[model samples]
Target: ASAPIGSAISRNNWAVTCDSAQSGNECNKAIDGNKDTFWHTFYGANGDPKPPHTYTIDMKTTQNVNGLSMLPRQDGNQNGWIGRHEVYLSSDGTNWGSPVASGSWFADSTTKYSNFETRPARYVRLVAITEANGQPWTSIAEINVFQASSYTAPQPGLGRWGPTIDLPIVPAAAAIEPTSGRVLMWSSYRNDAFGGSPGGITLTSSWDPSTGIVSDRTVTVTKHDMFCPGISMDGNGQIVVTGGNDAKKTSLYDSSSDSWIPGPDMQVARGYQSSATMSDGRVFTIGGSWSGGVFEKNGEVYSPSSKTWTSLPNAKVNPMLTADKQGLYRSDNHAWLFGWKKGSVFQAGPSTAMNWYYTSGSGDVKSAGKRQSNRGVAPDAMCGNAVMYDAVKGKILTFGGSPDYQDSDATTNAHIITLGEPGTSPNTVFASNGLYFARTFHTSVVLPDGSTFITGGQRRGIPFEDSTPVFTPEIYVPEQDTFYKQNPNSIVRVYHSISLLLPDGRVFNGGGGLCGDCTTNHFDAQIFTPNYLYNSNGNLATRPKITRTSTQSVKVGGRITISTDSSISKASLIRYGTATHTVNTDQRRIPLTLTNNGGNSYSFQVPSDSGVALPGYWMLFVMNSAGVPSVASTIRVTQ
Candidate 1:
């Protein structure tokens, strides 16, 4: 960056330069120093050439802009300019002009000029007067126009999360930041909060994009447990809510009034569904389910302007919707519907009878009539156990769910489904690796990247009578098509919870039960940072090399460094004969020390928590740099 102000004075063929001022007697007198340059003068001249370039003034219009006050350039003397210089300004950045206002060559007193007023020039201009008669010319390092404007006004919630005070009443599940300074959220919540037991509260909130602070205020939706709120806003910011808890009722809420008005009830009630608005400005709520008692139909659509519900001809198979704006050629603008009992997925059309449908009214959904003689692709192929549509990645991913006998231990069946070409099978796109904790009631969230996140639910072999929730979350990388446990051998948390994929590419694990012993366990949710990229040699990389030792009892805080191949940073607690106790605080490299204060052995126990996957591997007690215990080792009494 150029030193616009000070350099204008010194950089040219000026008589007195910034260096000449510091080296000469006349300028040195004001700085109260000998020929040696003083701190104030050196900084004033800006010893460094310039700072990284940033717009000093980025206003839409620089109207009535006047006096320009920049801190002293080179020498400590702030009284006035030590060298001769020129200042310039421009209207359209094309033709420039000389300083509209000029100052007599002089330095102000020795103080940093923060609001030092500039000459009252409308736009702005700069030119150095004469230099200090005997001293070398001085330079103006920076020129801060004293216009009392920062170009960018402080946003409503500048420092905190949820930058905007009020969110756009759109039922968007995620936000996409396509540009550097702008963030667009996909907030689509449309179901009515008309009536329910655990009523709707503000279910979602925003976090600061930069600082990561959560906006304390929540946008109020009418109902509770609002998942997959489908919504769209017309040219006017009026939002339409459809397909939430009730799934059948469609309502409209005005951002201006914050009021909810009943729109048309859909032909069918759907929850955890997806919707798409058409080119003609009609909103479609598709693939939601109502109480089997209310209506046998599984899906329907609603129009905002007409306030009418239209029944589409065909219902979706395994309804859990996700859309890919990029997969435009493959399906509708929005394509999502996972795990409907019908077993397969159906591409939602304008009417089930149409040949095909297009948003801009360009095409129509291909009618079943055209394929009657051809024998169309079988819908039974898609009867999937689970499904999720990735809007960003343009891929539909579905994972395991048991059809008949509940795989109560949370095992995802060896199947996954991809919504494409109509004839695809669940096993064709299923993940290759096994799920960390076999699950059924769990959730699979697709990330901005093609990867999927598997979280919550129960472990295999554990039924309700003996079943407990899983805490450890897992990450499924679609690129590799493998499932990687979040933190290997972590705790269990399942049921009553859902894993939310945030706009900024992180998993917010809120809600649900604990993994360890229920009575003593706490609901402290854990946040997992994806893309940790640890190697085989990284910290906690390899499993500890277990060496069943012959050594016996050891006192608390006693040092018992291992001479074997193990190099664990924390305590490695294992069964020594019958007693479980802390054996080491340091590792093989450092001194492995143990100090058991819990009085009980550190071995794992509890019927539900017994075995390899229960109570997690083994909790070890390690010490931080300060020699304080890391995570204390604990083992429940095994019945």
Candidate 2:
């Protein structure tokens, strides 16, 4: 059995041979058990040890010792502290044989510990190998020696996701602030006093995954129903919001000042509109319905640089589509746009039948054809299929939606759509595999690893009117062409529910409602931290850091130098977009060609064509070979 000796119970029995009384700091003070007093190793009153030094402790008897601990000097100046240290024990007061335990310590006032196999000795010693702050001095407020029968070390690598975090209001629209890692969310007017009036409110919130804490603020937006506003971030990091429902008021959230300011109204009132940032910092707002259900074909452009709104020509739409039991419905009718090469835009579908292509400022529309045909049940079976440009594969991939409005028939079909040369129609081919969740109105976000994370769709039916909500989330690995179900969410995120890829690499899932109930109001949110956040050991991985970027402003197709904490495997740009209705025009991933220039220095080329990469601010990320992404470094893409 192990038993503590002498000074462990009575300080009067403690004695030291290397007592430094030059400045009244005695070695005996360490075991004196009074933290107010401390021991300092010094050559004299002002001089200290320049190299490794050791001090002896007389335990007064031969007993088993299992652990040792030391407290940093409690004095305000902790600069004179030990860094690396070793512990040794001896039966006699002479030879210490070899170190029984060794470790490192931080330069703080916290307690340090080391445990070792049971060793019987009358003498114990502590050896300081390095001093913190490059200082030659080492000090300790106290030392604790223990002789326990057993010692257990706290283990590591227990990373986990948080529970469903309830929020103050529903977040129909949300985005992440580039610099502060804060979340910005807002929605149309809703009864606040548990059913008072629909007050348009914007909430600024912060979520710390380490502690599972969510702090938020509720700020009022323009007193209009911002039910479905177009959201995007400008070059300067300002969140510019466009029309919603019957409300034409424009609003911008300035993260720098933590406030929302109103801008001029759009040329036309809109709801369910899709918007994206252009090469010139102008946001393109396209395709939405007027207050009375009239679909607006013309789109408008809001320029942040000149603070002006320009009416762009009426973007062409598919004319053959119809809304009825016989053909595709209106809710399924919407154009999803993605930039391909420089100055080129590819528009796919108003419910699976139409495709169009256009160049910036050209006002010329070319037919890419009706890429999808009937798949038995319905002539044109795929509508609301999730589509995204897979830069890694150099092709546009679309997956899962519905064959009809009832959604009684959900398609497991997935297709690969490739944009051909100008004036040539796009082609679509079926992928052998389909989605794990077969429904529509879901969100698909391209992750830093080049895989797409698909989440929040109906399990069996359509949105609100008559459907079943799917709380399960899945990740689609493009490299493997398969899906893996991730942690499920408690909220029924259907219809108006949204998901965004936060800068920290976590996915923010929120929004949706049934009939004004807690679940329907969708007043809360959930964050999904992918497995990349943890290592194979299940411990939190050490994320690579971006030290600096050559320039904050760069032109498309330009070259920018970057410095990181270490070498990287991949470098790319992703736009921080405002998303709603499963459509995020601003959100797209562009692969950058990275060339390593040796140790921490690398240069990557930005996509040259404005049409290929679009202009505005994009999140610059560098991933290690391990696939852990660094905190996004925001950069502006100029023409």
Candidate 3:
């Protein structure tokens, strides 16, 4: 009770940087409010920096201060636990009159504190003199300045992050199992790391949200180390995973049988490519020199009947590639693809210039003109995120990415594209509301209630490292045309992270590092209940119930009958999603236009175009006027 954490201090209000810092584990990690992440002296490529390192924080405005504390790196590794340290308070930051307290902390991973007299100071600096082992390195998990009383950290109080649960492996790849209401997740080679060249094994796990149970398994039959693959849900209710570690391998997970099937292999091997489920229920893949050796890596479609990949000779990737530093090698990685009418696909971006590819015949690619912003052509956003949020309206939202794949500053630029019909040029661009944070390597989940939830990305693109992490979750309300910041999570998810919408209307936010023992591998997950789930009192609101539907399987252009406990104003069919590398081509929402009848029963017309609502299983949600959605009911559509 003597020393309390300062309310004025935080990464939001305090500007912090360090004299010595690692590439991804930057000084910002110390104040990021995530204890699992840490700030370390330069190591690895930059080489370890000699100690006497200091991190200075500008509180912006001076307030009361009593003491300062340092938390040693929480991991088992004690490489940089601080042995000696000093704290200084400054009015101008340039002039630090004297050390508030100087002492050597015990050689352990404990919270080290130096209590001092309460005073007013705008600047606070923590200097690391030596390592706990008497070496020349320094590391800290967190830092906080103390005031007179315990100051509570700010939380949005809108949405809530449910208690976290441990996972067997990092869920780098995740998809909802439609046959059975469960989640399928996998990591490469090992449970927590990527090892071996051209890996042959994958660690897979299934999580049942309703039961709170996790079952872990190792896959060796298919031998698909789906480390960074293009994944999507096929019409057969199977998760189609193509190329990652075992570059050319194709693995399919049958949710109904709970089994894995070997692949028929793509004509051209790829890794870090993009795959989409076409209107005809074929899986189309394109570009990925990020893993396999550099080559053409043109478009190819996988037939569900013949179980083979047919090369599309004319659908080359060069036209949609970005001007990355790695050239063709990185340019085509993780393209934003939306499967459209007629067996065509729209490549929205990673590049400013979008394109249309027709998978009919031998397949053809044509320029769709460049997507534009306020000034001119939008900058090429490598590793950015895009989602086909609305299918009937053909509205896709694109936002946040770096100029380069790695080691580059991210952008907050965003755009809305109302896609044209199949075979039509659709670089259709309208400048949209920008993101609250310029993020890359983050994950975005499309909410059933007609909003987009984005979480955990870095301000810069740095693979396998939790650097410049943005902890605050944001919800993009299309109706409001604005982004609202939500409660902050105390975890860092970057690089290999993933997020998905659950059947219960909650979101699964998990995974980060695949780098072994790097203190970044997040083998856990948390459920986020969107603000719509809360009432005016900030408590769980009673959700509308989907009593019944005409049938789980319906023909395209069919009129669907539904009975709900509440008179809902809107309905949506959100396709089951399978995602990795920030791309989820399978997930798209289609608003159901319907007429309500007297007895709480309604009839909604399914999109006549199979391409608009692709042939596959989806989650049907009914929402009342308040935007609160009921737990989704399963729906399967056929052409």
Candidate 4:
């Protein structure tokens, strides 16, 4: 409130009271008892209405004006949906111009506008394009634009900026290794059914975390059923894939070998199972439905060094097993084994028997697995899948499977529980972590950030062939205790698949689908990123790596152009100590050759701020056409 039409006069002059019965009230009808009806510009109507007092505008002035903020009050019509407001600006009252920047109508959620920098204009007007809540009336509380000389640019890492390109494969589950940061994925379904040869499944494409790109093994295996192939890396950098179609075979793929070879096969032929790697360098293959029954408790441990399978005798007593990083692996002497009875369907675990090595071992709390009741009582017991996050105080998250659906009581049965160091009982079940959708045969991946992505699979309790596995997936964020439903942002496929998490924080999903069924067939693959990073220079360009004979001293941020071996394949910005970034922006990998003004050695300056978030610990990664990083020289930067 001030002089010059700022206070009393401004409020009085700007305010208007509506009288439905007034002579020149625009003759607008009430949508309800509330004056929510819109005043149209003499649009054709019954003899009830005529000229409108309210006017629309199209800007003509070149003055810098902030965006006009408009928000409809939340009401019954809100229905959580919101209506967008159309903003118009015109010089002359008649002949209004088109909207330069109009908001989408809100069908749900109350709309909020902080600031929208758009075209310069004068006369500004906004039209409510949608309704809110359940109310029939449209209401507005604020509508105006102001000028400001001071504006701040967005700080780095403030929010997801954009540079990620989602890949082309639909994924079911993903795995990431910290040592090398390679991702591994497993079986996926489409139309809710497994595809591929009679029972063949596919391998997950590998993703380089430094640069978001997916690389699948060149070799392909014969089709197998949804063996739910689970992959984990051994200390030696060899990846182990366990539990696929019968023969219950295990295959280890050495990135360097490029060829695949059989490791040790499981004691029995099993598919539709899960597996994980132990820090002790052992790969454990657990539960799945088998020829004689629904629950296969037969857990097999494959020793990479020995290339043999040692049956965990204790596992023989349990019959159903899910291996995550939980149990007494680190604290106690052994890891845990969970699942159902020798055969029937009912779920429980967080077994009291602490040490797998010695059940009666001293300090080992001798206790039976707690029957998970939160899943509600059911007839069958196949409803258990476990995920262990080695990072989160060793918590184990479990999700849906079927109690054979044959059980009349099976519904949404997903629960999470934790166990203290080996032999210690878990105080309580972490019922806090639940899923929004019910999925079976689905896969789960825990990211470095502790967020988990659960995707693709048939619904639990429903027959595998009858249910349409999820095309879209969802992520479970433990922080919010909420699940973010992420539909297939791209690519769609069916069973016989895999999903791998890249080093740069993206997931690569590939393979799977009944090779013949169009609905379930998928020879294609894709990747999904959080939608960050941007390539402003159109497609990605590779940086040339050259062999230099220079004696020039280079700093971190210094820039220098050099020679090249051939044309460039891929170029990347990386941290010195970080893993190799994936430079897949280009359709194909290119060899980067240095061609900097006849200079032999490439040079770069050092960053001023050596903060953790932007920890100046970086480098420039250049990949050749063969997708290989530089081998000539390794640059090391000091802290």
Candidate 5:
């Protein structure tokens, strides 16, 4: 996170190329921000243009150019990749200077970056001397120049952090109440310890960032530890928490009354399970053998209308088990679940084998495929995490976990999961970059800017102990197609730590060490202010505001109009997050399909399919040209 603080220079300005074969493979496609398209030398007629294929990019202005990255073509084609390459920087677009970087790149679809000291430059040129296949043709999927940020971020090329907040207990679970914008979080049985009739009592608290006040309470009514429980926000805005300590117990919390109520217990008592809110307005849960019993926990549903639990005998965990030697204890704990088409759930990994669960007609599990596509098998990642970073594209970013549950080192591995149509295999490809640090038990929250904020965790796999903690945080940006280091934090948030995006556009990262009488137990938290919040100068940036809206609630396929104080480039609908133990079933970010209706007013259609925008209360945020997001306007999305 040092001063290299790079931002992609304008690739959209202009790009000139020496060769072009087809209109589909034009020179501009290399800077088009899409890896699916590419610029390739024409293999036919007079356009092939043989060797030394080159492309030049004009940055519009002289910037502090730090690096350059180029992605090879990704359409299953092996020809046309550049073998010998060279790069140059010039202020005028045509200066006769020596190449700044040169090397022979291996044949692959991986991203390639330039390594050089930062300097002022208005133009960059990439020269492909030879093809990787020993042919005359060359290709580039996308290319971008990295320029150091002009704005001064707080204490970092990364972002800024607020002062730590001392809490009554380690916040093992957290959810932002959609209506009040207050965070509701809790720890296990005792405020700090885990004993004494484990689920007899749970310490709960509410923190309001708007008022900067913290209120404490006890949940004796729904005396489930709720510690490692599976939780999701229902379409009706009620928090359904099922099974943890007091293992078989089910608890419900509604934002309207702000009270905890006991719901029907699961037919199977479980802990460390994962669940999802189905498109049909039902809650489907499964796979938790960590506590209560060592059984092969199957799938079940909580019908909101009937208010009862129905066991799904056919939704088995056998096909989706990870390669963990600890067996069902850890293998079945955190199956990454996402709501897909009507009454269906897509179970992506922690495991290599992907499966889809049908939530209707007695429920059934169908094998989608292995996590591998054209690439090799993805490593087994236990304690690692994933998120629906882009809903419309159905892209899931999965990263950072160990092969085993404990005693093993963590990995810097990362992959991008792109979903297909209902009951089809998702395209799993290697991410452009990995974490700056290896991690397990780290938490990731989707920000309003379409970036994922990751914090906490340990490089070592020993649970409950703070060994080799990754103090620095990082974020994953889809625009740059890579991960970048962020401002570092001093806390060790390994196991039991949680990070949730608050409505105010900052991230709340805290909570670690919840063992009985253990020194690692941290009773505190902090707020992370992203770099988007600061101006081009070193000071706080002026933010765009949402002046008015057409409605607070809309149905699937309905249109809603929003008026902002200024012109904006983007708007997003993010599901309210409810999380526990590295699993947030409600975390989803949908880029609103916005249409300009007039001056400062915009309208976008809600996704016609409930599968894309699961029924729930969501946060609507609009961003200006500077990428700064306004405070979120809460919206209810119904089926």
Candidate 6:
């Protein structure tokens, strides 16, 4: 008999059990839908059962069935193969009738099949009456039961996007602080484009979790236009924003003092540049527009200890290769540098090149040159792109950007590059299969659940900034390789918007409207609450809380312990991101492994590499077994 044409039968509430099963050979694996993972029976030193072992799968509900199938384990020497088995059906748990069909299994990786007359049944049981060696042993890779008809894709547990609020100044740039969850946003233009002078402006806000209230505060910057600047948190947790429109000026913001300090100037003036913190505790800034026709390729490094800047070699690749052809001859602003171990940076864009830079005594630095990765061709030209380091997976992920300067050509393509070790060649780079909505100048923030949340961008090209903006948000699930569309925002954040991950587990979306024709420059913002905030039944989800910590401060590549009431599945040290020009060069998601002490206590190591977790404050979140994340606790990584 042929199987049903519907989706896989729903096993939401289904249960499993087996007679004479081993400790690690639990029966749950048989229905996990993955053929690569399986369940086996124990026979030897562990615990032995005489014979006639049976494995039963409870569907949790009655359904029409016609056929069933089972695959054997793929491991070498299939000694635990079932020679003969009888398949029976049951409407209730206790009573099971005579065999509906009998089948003989085979060794190797062959699949065993049995077909039966169509009937409504609640349970399916396989009685292994015989084994290959006349012992109580059996193994199955996967199990599937066919329904009559009508099946659809399962529902995903993703959150929705909330409404947007307007800000007072253009939020061309933004950064979320680690401890207080304060949002610091700034822009190149002064307030009142109709009347005020063109300099720089800033805005700050605090988001309350229990009550969705956002209180805003106004601030100002130096006379220089801080447009397209590289923003990062320094070793002392100060915000170091460097290089902007028509100037090499650097601005430092101290949260403790709540003040901005003007810089001593860089070696060269650059706009649209990107920056990364090196492993040796120095900030490196590279690539930008110098003038009408020149692309600034040279870079500079800044040292906090010495309070000075030093020049380095020019960028290995031309960041503006397609700008002239795309009518962006004057400037190109999409290149990204994702830093990893030993000051090695991955220039993420149209080229699959890795640039490694080293610093010698007293801030002397030189480039190790760039190497083209053998990881396959790069994706389409992505200007205004967003890239984030998946420290958990040790890979860099690139997201939405336009092939050209125009918004109409924006792409949702997501490409992943696995970091290559020092001597290893041929790192893997592959395109993900999920389709995403096209957008430009949007912000992608890494959530505590290990998923990425993207918000705010123009639906049309950059030239048509007044065109309807994309208020709706989306979240990308890495494991499933899928993007889920969420609720829409009220404000239209076109050219210069910002989205950041707050310490409270909510994503803060702020600022936009640098477009001249825009009706108004959006200075407002809002927060996105993920679905994990609520239970599966749509009620509020109980969250895990951190009771105490062994230490809030740790040496570079050291260890820290967290005490919690609930068990944890995973933990991560996520940087409080700085946002600008659709990219946060310093933002990252680093995974930490856990060491259990047989209780609610678990320990994790600080990343040994400074480039991985730069010397600064980071938000540490411990996720529960159900994937719910606790409100973050602040931890500092020091060299």
The number of the candidate with the highest lDDT is 3
User: By the lDDT metric, which is better: model 4 or model 5?
Assistant: 5
Backbone collision tally, model 3: 0
**Model 2: colliding residue pairs:** 157-539, 189-198, 190-198, 343-611, 374-379, 513-520, 514-520, 556-608, 557-607, 557-608
lDDT of candidate 5 over 1-639, digit per residue (tens): 011125677765665665554667888888888989988877775556677888787778788775677788998887788766667889998793756555444456656555343567888888887776778788889888887655233364478765444455678888888889988888887655664544657788777877655566789897677878888787767899888887888888899889888888898888889889988767888888877898878899997778899999788888888878888888888778888778888888788888899877777999888776445787778888888999889898888888887887888888888987767888888776578899998998999978899888899977788889997888999889878888776557888889899887899886776786666665556788899988867567788999989999999899999999999899999998987778887989999878998899999988978888999888999999998899899989998
How many clashes in candidate 1? 97
Per-model CA lDDT versus the true structure: 0.32, 0.61, 0.81, 0.37, 0.80, 0.63
Better of 4 and 6 by lDDT: 6
Q: What range of 10 consecutive residues in model 1 has the weakest lDDT sum?
A: 578-587
Off by over 4 Å in 6: 1-156, 163-166, 192-223, 290-295, 314-332, 350-376, 422-428, 463-468
Highest-scoring model, TM-score: 3
What are the root-mean-square deviations of the candidates from the true structure over C-alphas? Answer: 26.6, 15.4, 12.5, 19.3, 22.0, 22.6
What lDDT is reached at residue 121 by model 5?
84
RMSD of 2: 15.4
Write candidate 2's Cα lDDT for 274-373 as tens digits: 5665545556665565242455345566767677666656445433242425332243233466644543446654344544434356244566666553
Specify the poorest-scoring 10-residue window by lDDT in model 6: 363-372
Q: Estimate each model's TM-score.
A: 0.38, 0.66, 0.77, 0.44, 0.75, 0.68
* lDDT of residue 76 for candidate 1: 56
| lDDT over C-alpha atoms for residue 97 of model 6 | 65
Lowest summed lDDT across 10 adjacent residues in model 5 is found at 1-10
Candidate ranking under TM-score, highest first, comes to: 3, 5, 6, 2, 4, 1
